[PDB]
Amino acid sequence: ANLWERFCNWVTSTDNRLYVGWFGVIMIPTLLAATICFVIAFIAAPPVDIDGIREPVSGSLLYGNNIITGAVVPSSNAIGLHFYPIWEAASLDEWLYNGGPYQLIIFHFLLGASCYMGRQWELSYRLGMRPWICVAYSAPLASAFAVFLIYPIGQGSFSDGMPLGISGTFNFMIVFQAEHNILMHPFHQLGVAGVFGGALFCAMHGSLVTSSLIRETTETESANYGYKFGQEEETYNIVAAHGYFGRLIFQYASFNNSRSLHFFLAAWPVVGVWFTALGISTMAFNLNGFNFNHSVIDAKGNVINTWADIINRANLGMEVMHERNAHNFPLDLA
Amino acid sequence: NRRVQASLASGATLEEAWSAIPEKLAFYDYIGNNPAKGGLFRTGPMNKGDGIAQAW
Amino acid sequence: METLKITVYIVVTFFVLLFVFGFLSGDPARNPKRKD
Amino acid sequence: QGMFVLPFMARLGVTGSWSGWSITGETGIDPGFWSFEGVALAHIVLSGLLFLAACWH
Amino acid sequence: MEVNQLGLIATALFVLVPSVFLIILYVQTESQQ
Amino acid sequence: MEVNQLGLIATALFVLVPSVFLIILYVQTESQ
Amino acid sequence: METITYVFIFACIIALFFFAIFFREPPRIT
């Protein structure tokens, strides 16, 4: 009946159209800050000296960018890992030139996303559910942490975090391959397996359930109207689906336990994306993909190239050209 | 014209008297800035018509 | 800039205290089955 | 330049931009919030709050 | 920027034509029930 | 002819928008 | 004109979000 207890009750209420919760109390403002700053920087921010070499890169629409090329540009290499809030700048003019908004956006977003994952725990508890949906979302979350926070920490500069834009993303990928040979790293290969397999099993499961829908409708109506929200009976025949799939391959390569199946569906891409987030996060400390450059040589010692050496030729061309003005000494050590 | 007739009174030359007229004031004495010189489907800024005024 | 600094400091502190005191206000008991 | 609402802001005392120019030609000036950009921002924000008020009523 | 001038009409019709189609179908669905 | 390039879009939308309005209203009249 | 177009579309998507959430067909049980 007391003021605080009433507030606590609204915060944690399961009647709010959108659940708030204690994690929401941090999430709502941090995401709003990040979103507003991003929308405005994407449209109107002046160019940013990402690499600290007084060579501003234009990222916003009003400075000659389209949707594909635009980006909020990472903060200056001259700042490195230093905290650069607005109030640390002599002016907004300075803060804009040096990449201030990237830092504001990504810190608020990492906080708000972290709270997003907590909020998934919290509502699950209020509704009497099992709790581990938030564990599934920790795979995408870890991946964002890796490219916005972990990789900058290991390389010493937010200027090497991932730009918030479409082409910026591709720039990050090409530079990453040249320096870490990420294609040749097992954790990236597992990530592709998690993501290709995720797409595969998505299609499989959707096709098998769709294939064994029980006839409930006429040909003139969407079969979707054969299911009513909250009906107790299943809407497909799982034994017919098992009977099809077990014969398509062989019997014991098919699930007939729906719980094991759906757990499988959860586990495969989650685990694969954990590894690929861990791959980024460990190449942050320069433990790179396998190097087989010149591993094969002949009886005399001539190098016999393999596909790995051809990769390396590509990698070199990415190496020698990236940040073409930023390097004064012969090794790009970070 | 008032201003010109005054300068010549004080004994400036024609060049001097006319050189003392501000550009802003001459630019007003030009029919291209007369609001009654347009057309209903002649669209856009006045600079799109006679151009961007650069100098008197 | 200091006005801003101060403002942000107060706003963050405020939201963090909401968060800490909210979870200290008997959060285990706010579920639909066994309450304590 | 075909400016239509710019003069109505100028008319009542808004004369400078956040980028440091004013319409009177004076450079290096701090208009505070109530610049041309701040007045526009205000009308956008106001528009969005009125939008939500309309859904409620 | 020196963009293709038909990009605007391309984009406007690309949005407008199929959207209008969906709206026509939805509204006449609602006046049925 | 050196015509106005926004002429095309103005004409197109001038036709399209009001016409779609009327079509929307006529079709939902018919289905009740 | 291309900036206006890009922002116009983006803004239509945010408005659609509002309607899809607050003005959805409510799910009703059985």
Add this chain to the structure above:
Amino acid sequence: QTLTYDDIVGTGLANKCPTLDDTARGAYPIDSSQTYRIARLCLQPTTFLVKEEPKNKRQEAEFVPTKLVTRETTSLDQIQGELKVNSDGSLTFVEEDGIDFQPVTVQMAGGERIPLLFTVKNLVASTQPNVTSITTSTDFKGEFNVPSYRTANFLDPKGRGLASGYDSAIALPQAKEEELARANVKRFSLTKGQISLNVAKVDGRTGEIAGTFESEQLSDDDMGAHEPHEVKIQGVFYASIEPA
């Protein structure tokens, strides 16, 4: 109290030139039979002014003020060189070495970024004749060199450069090149600047001086892509003198 690195780091003080005590109103005498050097010359800018383009007839625009956006990275320091005595009692400082350039970019009203190579490279500055004492009325006047803001290896965003890079617009293979010549052929400018140093404080005991400086130079021309601006720079200086 002599401050250490860990007292300075992160304060901004490392960008400031040493100050002289407000009492330092001496005179440093000059023995033409001796030889002298500046052991350290420190220049610390406080104001960046940029000349506007009035576009019209005989108006000649003025120097408008600018906002610095590159932070506390602007001071020249550790500059040294001969302080000679001429056959007329004038003094000439000849710069030899030092951190004698800083790239700076300031922003004008309207958002135009003006980058510039704030420098005193190859500075030669002279006093009036018959000095015999450096006092709180001594003035040095000199000129220096202003090399291109970017040096010859610099590659523009399409890969074009002077001592490296493409020699054409390779994304426009069959475009007419005549229109692109200004941007395809890089050029290394080398212009002169002018400086006044006005001595206002003198520690007669230690040979330290300090005062005020104004320099005029050209901004960046982006290897001839565009025309430069004229830049006025105002600030404070500090120099230490030594028998050579």
Add this chain to the structure above:
Amino acid sequence: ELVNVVDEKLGTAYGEKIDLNNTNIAAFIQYRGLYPTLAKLIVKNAPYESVEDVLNIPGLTERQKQILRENLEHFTVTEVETALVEGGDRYNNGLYK
């Protein structure tokens, strides 16, 4: 009228010998006895009006003068090109392997 002055310079003796007034110091490694000691002195004392001027570098030992004579025919002088001598590019022109 707009000319790349480095390309133009490759059309001179700079493009075939070691230019005592412009070439980067790493080129003195192509001939014996020149690098780093004499190459250092040479670069520091440029410019030269004639190739013969390098023998009048104060401090040369008689053996250092012998090495220069041996190599005078691999040298040239041309006008100083700002683009090649600014930025300390005669000591490090950004080229490694």
Add this chain to the structure above:
Amino acid sequence: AELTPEVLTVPLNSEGKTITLTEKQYLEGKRLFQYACASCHVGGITKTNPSLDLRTETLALATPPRDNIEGLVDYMKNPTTYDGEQEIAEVHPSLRSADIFPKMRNLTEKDLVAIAGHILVEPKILGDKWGGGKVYY
């Protein structure tokens, strides 16, 4: 192709005498080069001074010529600059400086011959790759 005595034949000195290493020696030289030298000299370049490489044509123009076993063995003992004007044992590994470069402590006279031999053979197998840098990888 194979590791024939012709390729294992390298100059012993300036006078023109030569010496034919064994395959044992070559591999031992390669291994010792990797142990003591590759951290700076991988592929025959110099990571900390790229203007000086281990190409035979470069070694030949060095003072003391170093394109032979003797000059290379002397170099690992008393390294000098390229013109020979100064001794650099304090910044370059050598037996003279094995106290400050501890990896040189346990190198015997025969180990030096193998290291020197590998350096002289390897451009005969790899060509421009040896000392050519990334362009040739």
